[PDB]
Amino acid sequence: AALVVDNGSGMCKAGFAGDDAPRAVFPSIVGRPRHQGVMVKDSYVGDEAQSKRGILTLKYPIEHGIVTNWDDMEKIWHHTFYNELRVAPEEHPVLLTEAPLNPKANREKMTQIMFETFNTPAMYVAIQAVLSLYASGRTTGIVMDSGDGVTHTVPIYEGYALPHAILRLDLAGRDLTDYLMKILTERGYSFTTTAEREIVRDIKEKLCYVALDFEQEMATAASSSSLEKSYELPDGQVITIGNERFRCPEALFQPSFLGMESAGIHETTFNSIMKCDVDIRKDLYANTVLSGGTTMYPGIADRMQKEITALAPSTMKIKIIAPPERKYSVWIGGSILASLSTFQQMWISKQEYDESGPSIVHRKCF
Amino acid sequence: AALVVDNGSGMCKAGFAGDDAPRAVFPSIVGRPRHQGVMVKDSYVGDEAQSKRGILTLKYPIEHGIVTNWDDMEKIWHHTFYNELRVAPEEHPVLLTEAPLNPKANREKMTQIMFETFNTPAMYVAIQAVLSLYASGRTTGIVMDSGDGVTHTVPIYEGYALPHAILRLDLAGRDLTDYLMKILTERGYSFTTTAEREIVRDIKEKLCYVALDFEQEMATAASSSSLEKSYELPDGQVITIGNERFRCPEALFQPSFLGMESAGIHETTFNSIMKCDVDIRKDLYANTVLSGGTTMYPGIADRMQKEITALAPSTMKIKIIAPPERKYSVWIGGSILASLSTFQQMWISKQEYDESGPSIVHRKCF
Amino acid sequence: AALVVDNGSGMCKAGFAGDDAPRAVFPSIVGRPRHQGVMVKDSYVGDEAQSKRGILTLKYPIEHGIVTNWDDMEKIWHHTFYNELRVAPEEHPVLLTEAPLNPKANREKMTQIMFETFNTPAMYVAIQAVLSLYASGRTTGIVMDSGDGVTHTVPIYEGYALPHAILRLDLAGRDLTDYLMKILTERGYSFTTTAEREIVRDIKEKLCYVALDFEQEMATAASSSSLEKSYELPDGQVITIGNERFRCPEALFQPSFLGMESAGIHETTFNSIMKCDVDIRKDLYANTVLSGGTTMYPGIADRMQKEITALAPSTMKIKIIAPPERKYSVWIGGSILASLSTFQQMWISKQEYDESGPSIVHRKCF
Amino acid sequence: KVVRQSKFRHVFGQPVKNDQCYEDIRVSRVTWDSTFCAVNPKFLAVIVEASGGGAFLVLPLSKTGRIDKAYPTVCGHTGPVLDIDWCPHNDEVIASGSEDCTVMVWQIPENGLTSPLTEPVVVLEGHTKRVGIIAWHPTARNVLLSAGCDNVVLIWNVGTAEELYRLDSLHPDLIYNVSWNHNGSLFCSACKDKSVRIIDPRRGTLVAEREKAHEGARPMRAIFLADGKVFTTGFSRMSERQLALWDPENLEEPMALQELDSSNGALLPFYDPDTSVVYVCGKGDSSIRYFEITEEPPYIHFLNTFTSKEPQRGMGSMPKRGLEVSKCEIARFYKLHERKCEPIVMTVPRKSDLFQDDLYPDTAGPEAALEAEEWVSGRDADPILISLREAYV
Amino acid sequence: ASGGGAFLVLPLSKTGRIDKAYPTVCGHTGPVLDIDWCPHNDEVIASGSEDCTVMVW
Ligand SMILES: Nc1ncnc2c1ncn2[C@@H]1O[C@H](COP(=O)(O)OP(=O)(O)O)[C@@H](O)[C@H]1O
Ligand SMILES: Nc1ncnc2c1ncn2[C@@H]1O[C@H](COP(=O)(O)OP(=O)(O)O)[C@@H](O)[C@H]1O
Ligand SMILES: Nc1ncnc2c1ncn2[C@@H]1O[C@H](COP(=O)(O)OP(=O)(O)O)[C@@H](O)[C@H]1O
Ligand SMILES: [Mg+2]
Ligand SMILES: [Mg+2]
Ligand SMILES: [Mg+2]
């Protein structure tokens, strides 16, 4: 019974190998009380923190795909094994996921905690981008992984990755949530505290969408009310948003909205494929696979295809692969890979690490 | 056995810890003679002042929850221990109550009085708002204590208070007693003395009620004698009142009747909830608790629920909790608190105070 | 003879271009009677409302930099043109100031009312933050703007603004004034009516100051009477305040005093600088400019400098610019800008607006 | 009678001002659960992260404020440093153990470090695995105890660089922590087998052993008390953190057993023999809990708790000699964040501004009672006590 | 209205709080300036907006 744990910047997905969906999906947040109790637990992790977020100060242990504080990070893992999965970590091998171009120091800390703090029998860590292609059942393609912390573009050809062509874009869902926060002020709605941030994130996940033509959508919203949508706040208040539904996701293609000099995802995909060899660009053009929760905006694939087609040569066949379950593509691929018979030799034993150290972890891993 | 003493602005309640009802309840009143003796005591307290009020001038030692005379207040306590509970103060630990956001200097004054002038062995102070929630068996909710001197609205969520959202209304039953005295003159009845004022209070506690619809009640009272009631004065004179039964309690919802531009009591609760976090307003709406002797008017809960519902969003469930014993929630909750085995830790001994002083008193305040 | 109008949350400043100081400065309030006239004007605006505030209900048409009532707001402008300035709005161009990141709809309503109601010949809208830098005679620097409703931090480099780095703080003079009431009640002084709010504001503007060391000031204030000051009420009563002089301004540095989850003013300024490019943080640290009436507290600049120094790297040279006339920096900068020869092309004519609409106003303005 | 008689029931914690802290410190990121900090009344030592090998930063106490990133450090180990300990009889001497299976002892200059320190005074190579436990002998001079991951306990004479004693066949699993007794004659050890062992080093015999002291599999600690008892902090079968008191003459059942919470993180206890107060801090916890140990049942009385909003990475305790006696301060705690060290002052509220004799009984001085050769013979002596009255101002 | 123009038409009996998502008469491409009920038809109303059109409902 191998455990597949996919820890992201904002979301954490966990479950058992062979399953078709993660069993535990809870926010990766740690909350602490900001007031003094008057009726006679100093921290809350996951859904309980979300349920009590009114009196708590929510903090993300991972920021931009970087562990800003490992002490809360261990709490997330401890909450996963004992409070979410309700299993003993020492009895199940654990499959881990790493961001592309993960620092060796980051992997070492992840490895050391797993074998020492939790005393896992065996464990392995795999690239999130590679696992996403496993779920799609493809051996060649370029996957853009846009989650909560950072967006990555990793091209893979015939099972070979190209690290030199891997591009990083410091722009993800959390930045959108902040962008939705700032643009909601012009409509008269004020959200400042960390508790309000989750509320704004819920609105983003429910009412935001990607417009095929941003300029035409702006004209439509300025001359009609058909794009208005209403959201009910937890206190029973209702708010209405218009152009902000498609303005917030537009930062994906126009980072200058956030003041970022970097280019959009559509171009960032184009530079990445432009960086690899000429003979493999054909397969990557027709094998663009979308992964991450930030890719659930409706119509993002259609806008994706139109943008790259303008950049790509006219003779070139552009195919954007957006499976409906790509939010858990990293976890789904991990469960598939862990269920393979030929994966048993990639496992790293606790005794082996105790005598060899993290050197064996840098090897056998990419 | 500990002592639970609640020296409210107009009503003083006390009794042994663990009892279901306070042992002694007497008015917080100090009377002094106003006529010359002609036959062969400078002050009286409570009942011994009440039974002799015909020849005495009555003074409340506390106004709007502010101590006006410490010496009379000390006399109140001295009468309380020896004449009401009839026990030695040094033989029992005492649990004491204070108004929300009570000034620390005021909290220090009674601390000095207890340990020095009464030589109490142990002592603790608790907020009256929290004690009410203890009686209701709740950890989350907004409690509305309307006493004789002042009214407060204290929201509590999961045992955590929000001092910034605490609102105070300078209106309570004593102001209503003056208003009833004012609105009884037009009916032809004159009451001016403090002894007469207490008579008005008895009429207020017996024949007043909160009308669900004030204007319709005005229309009904002006066209029928059904609402008419008769009160007998101590001299046997029968006093008949009509619309004043519900006109006086209307002052809580319409403070403009007293010339006060402050909002209605119902609105004060709404603003207190509005001042708190968005995510915890749902629990507060369904956990509104009425406390204090002012909240004994019949039909006040129904008028409360109707008014706030008109202010809250329609999707919110409004629940008003008005236990029949809520006249003594502060004392009853204290009896529960002092009965808890875990309560023994936050006791403060006389020796500790004598060597440390005020600092240990303001600290340990839960 | 252009007109310079600087409308804020609590203060409204008006005058003529080229003048060193505003000619008319009056409170931005609208008063209405709350009693019944018995002796044989339904609203009062500005100073006349202040003089008659004893029988009026004072309301601010702007709350947190948001116009809560445009009808009362038009009264402010009408009182400004005809009563205060005593000039014809249709004969002089008007320069208007708007808060940073002003919503488009808010400018349109301001634009519409000038051209259609007052029929001004020419009009222009400028950023309040930019005008403050105009008065300081600087082209590069971050300006913090704390007024009555909202505190803003705007960095400007070589005439270029960075909207993504603009930070907003919902804490200003009105919030401090309300906090003063809450702690003044602890001293036994009861201020509840809207008329007393101006009185509390007057005490704040006269006796409040920023302590360099907040905890040290408590220790001095708790062991001496040197920090004690007396204020005379309009009815001749004299009140005495101690530590409250510097406790109220501390909320700017410690928003937790008001229960706010946001950071203090110094960190917000620091965070705004950190959001900018690395190469431009050199000049912003040495060009911090204070503006708004909330920056008039004695010692606020030194406490500003000490706090930011602890956050910035030791190699960073910090300069806090607090000109003595910074209470009118927005108006003064507007007067200089309106007097520039190269400014006449910024004007927008009423005829052009009639044939084009507010589209020409969104462009040519930032 | 209503209130249990105590002098520390109202002790409150207060962090020092911002300018009095130490920032810009890259604290070590090693999963080993040690104090990560050693402080003496002259210097502050904190384990830091180095790209190559291991190092710990030693700075004077007066050097507050921001710390230069290029500040010289004690970088002598070829592997990451696991733990550090100041010499009680020499404030300028600190021992360090690292992952390079060696122990090196350093001599700090009086004014601090002007250049990075690489060469140590004495190197101890007796462990086949990483050494994460070091403990100076409370009384005997130049005596150091080292316990590596090889389940081997060694006694070293740093003055002569000689391994005095070797204890190997005594710990079947990994050892958590080791603490000397009052006179230095005995030491207690916590092992991964949930067994608490009291061992005589000079004789190499197991004095007492309690198996399955805590049923949880999480790491657990064990310390000696001044009166001669053992305080163990461990976990239950339901993963609940517990505090236990043990009598070395009777270990069949603990004297007390209280459960604190179900939170994770090992509980590091800090004992104050003068006040008989143990401060319990947990790794990654934002609160510090202190308890009083007395003969009255239940022998473990919870006093109060200082609560913060930030988890700590390690903990260092200031001995009595460096405390501000005039301010009625009984303990100082250097809370370590991920990039900052925040001293915390533990203060007894007292009205009188004069010296409090009861709060400050005679404390062990910085002079060793015996020497290594004398202690080897079997001599036993209590630590020499000094008077804190002179520190009053 | 965020885009175009509309006016709210509700029954007289429909009192109290009206939900924010109540359907409105949103046909004009510009904000509505004036509205007038037909005196001879209680179910007919004409509206004028900034789109230079008069539109009868
Ligand atoms: N339906 C949705 N629409 C838009 N964004 C979404 C949706 N669901 C999730 N997200 C965004 O995806 C982000 C996290 O996605 P994911 O990659 O699955 O987890 P992580 O990034 O933590 O690994 C969140 O920040 C959230 O804002
Ligand atoms: N049955 C009743 N009906 C109406 N008013 C009442 C009733 N009982 C008490 N009151 C009024 O409530 C007021 C406050 O009571 P209480 O809350 O006990 O005062 P406090 O708590 O401030 O001592 C009293 O002045 C009394 O006149
Ligand atoms: N001398 C002073 N000391 C403290 N606060 C002041 C002083 N003068 C003005 N203020 C505060 O400044 C606030 C408004 O300042 P200003 O920015 O000029 O007005 P507005 O916010 O309307 O633009 C007022 O709320 C007032 O309390
Ligand atoms: Mg992810
Ligand atoms: Mg009361
Ligand atoms: Mg202003």
Coordinates of C-alpha atoms in Angstrom, one line a residue, chain A residues 1-6 13-25 80-89 91-95 330-339 347:
Chain A
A1 CA 0.0 0.0 0.0
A2 CA 2.3 2.8 -1.3
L3 CA 1.3 6.3 -0.5
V4 CA 1.2 9.0 -3.2
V5 CA 1.6 12.5 -1.7
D6 CA 1.5 15.6 -4.0
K13 CA -3.2 16.0 -2.5
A14 CA -2.7 12.6 -0.8
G15 CA -4.0 9.1 -1.3
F16 CA -3.1 5.5 -2.0
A17 CA -1.4 4.0 -5.0
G18 CA -3.7 2.5 -7.6
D19 CA -6.6 4.8 -6.8
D20 CA -8.1 7.0 -9.5
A21 CA -8.3 10.1 -7.3
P22 CA -6.5 11.5 -4.2
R23 CA -8.2 10.6 -1.0
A24 CA -7.2 13.7 0.9
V25 CA -7.4 17.2 -0.7
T80 CA -1.7 14.4 6.1
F81 CA -0.5 11.0 7.5
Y82 CA -2.4 11.0 10.8
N83 CA -5.3 13.4 10.4
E84 CA -6.1 13.0 6.7
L85 CA -5.0 9.5 5.7
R86 CA -5.1 8.2 9.3
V87 CA -2.2 5.8 8.5
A88 CA 1.2 5.1 10.1
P89 CA 3.9 6.5 7.9
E91 CA 4.3 1.1 7.4
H92 CA 3.8 2.4 3.9
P93 CA 6.2 3.5 1.2
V94 CA 5.7 7.1 0.2
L95 CA 6.0 8.5 -3.3
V330 CA 0.4 15.0 -10.9
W331 CA -1.3 12.8 -8.3
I332 CA -2.9 10.5 -10.8
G333 CA 0.3 10.0 -12.7
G334 CA 2.1 9.2 -9.4
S335 CA -0.5 6.6 -8.5
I336 CA -0.2 5.0 -12.0
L337 CA 3.6 5.0 -11.8
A338 CA 3.7 3.6 -8.3
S339 CA 1.4 0.8 -9.4
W347 CA 12.5 2.6 -4.2

